[PDB]
Amino acid sequence: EMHGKNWSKLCKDCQVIDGRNVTVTDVDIVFSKIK
């Protein structure tokens, strides 16, 4: 199970680029999820 408390961010089986200022440039595909 998962449980965050009042500001806590949490994940499982995840891919995160968490950060204050975040820029991505010239990309071909940012998000891709084939199943």
Residue stretches of the annotated binding site for Zn(2+): 3, 11, 14
Minimum Å distance from CB 8 to a second copy? 3
Instruction: Output the six-digit token pair for 31.
Output: 């998000």
Annotated binding site: 3, 11, 14
Radius of gyration of the chain measured on its C-alpha atoms: 14
Scanning residues 1 to 30, which ones bind a second copy (CB under 8 A)?
A: 1-30
DSSP character at residue 26? S
Minimum Å distance from CB 15 to a second copy? 4
Chain residues binding a second copy by CB under 8 A are 1-35
